[PDB]
Structure prediction request, 533 residues.
Amino acid sequence: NYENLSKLLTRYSTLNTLIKLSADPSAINAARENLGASAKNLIGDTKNSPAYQAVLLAINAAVGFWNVLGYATQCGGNANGQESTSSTTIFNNEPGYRSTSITCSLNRYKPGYYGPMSIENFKKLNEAYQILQTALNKGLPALKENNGTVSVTYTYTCSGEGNDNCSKKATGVSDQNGGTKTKTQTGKTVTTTISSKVVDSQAKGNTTRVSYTEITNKLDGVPDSAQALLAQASTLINTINTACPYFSVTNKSGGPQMEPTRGKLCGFTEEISAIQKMITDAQELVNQTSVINEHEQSTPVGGNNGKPFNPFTDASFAQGMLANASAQAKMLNLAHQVGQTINPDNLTGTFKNFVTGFLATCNNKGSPPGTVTTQTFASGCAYVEQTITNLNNSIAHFGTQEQQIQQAENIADTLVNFGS
Amino acid sequence: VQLQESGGGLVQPGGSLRLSCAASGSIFSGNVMGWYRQAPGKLREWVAAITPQGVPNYADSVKGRFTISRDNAKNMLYLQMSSLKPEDTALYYCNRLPNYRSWGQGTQVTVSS
Ligand code: NA
Prediction:
């Protein structure tokens, strides 16, 4: 129990320095400038932002997870989530087995848990995937950029007698041959144009021996903000987890080895929980953006009426300075934690093997981000290893800033206490 | 768990010293690690950092004179200091980046004729 301040400052010389800085407007103003520069490093920059790298990493882990396991995943049935007699529904630009499409053609079995994914779930998954892959290919924006958009186009086909997954009821489109329809939804308005075309079995250059319907979806104005893309990634991983369909893998000779070889997708429990946790932490991190913006530190502080600065009365700016500095530190810490959730250096057993042998691997013959080839399947193809590396580099290059943020936080905390 | 620096001492300007830092597995493994110093009348200053894969970077005040390294098999961090100057006098500390909240005791470096 320290009773007296000289005694307390004898033992803790750095506290003495802190008190001296807190009474000095030019040391306070210098810390506030530091916060403006570090905020810009976190929310304005990309490559050198730990926060940017961590967001990218959380999104890449979710996309990579589906690139690994999608080809193995059974799907099928008709539009109500019911079983089908003879429906083949194919989703393009998806990482199928030696294919840039995934085929849902499991009939008779009821869609559901440890069974095929329903086409309704697959459509949700697929849309999120297409959006994420288009954004990753274009490049994610800095965290402060909240109004960019991307355009996304994707297609799927239906064949087989009784297949209703491309019908008016499923699609919204009146004329199954040549009909088109537009709809919007929402604080950003995204416009979707859905169009349909029918190709007869014989007609012109029809590879497949028989007849099908093609659906094209074109989405304009899709928000590519960090928050919006993280919501897409959550939709992707959660749909997988909740639908929990049956899978059965093809293990290569030489290749890395997948255990188990057949099962249900939600059985990858450590993997899925990690990915969800990364997304959760990244959403919390991005959420600090508005705290930072709301408490800008660019206005200089000092006394009033030319009288000396009085740290007990003249410091109503301190609460906002503290909130800004704490929010920055929280961003940095959550960015770190996203990284450590997936970094294989601290993983063990089958989850480590999943990451090092599959997720942080790409078998495309590097292709840009968001590229789906006939060899994507069974590999992450989402720059996971490189993103972990870049996150670590950005953190090492944040050394000064982090100390400046702590010092600003401490100054502000001293002034909030004095003003109590 | 913990952070334990050693190797400090009083030396002559122009001299050299090697600092060591023993870190627990949980602090060190898969983490960026770094050195810091706190000089009289000042707050703690960052000095150098090193990624798990071994990429070093440095504050301008020490670049070209100090070398940071890590030994991943033993959870040890090192700072080789050369061409030391009076201005390098300080308590030196290691930590991960971002920092674990409880610092070790640090090791005193004093440079003086
Ligand atoms: Na510093």
User: Anything to note?
Assistant: Chain B has one helix and ten strands.
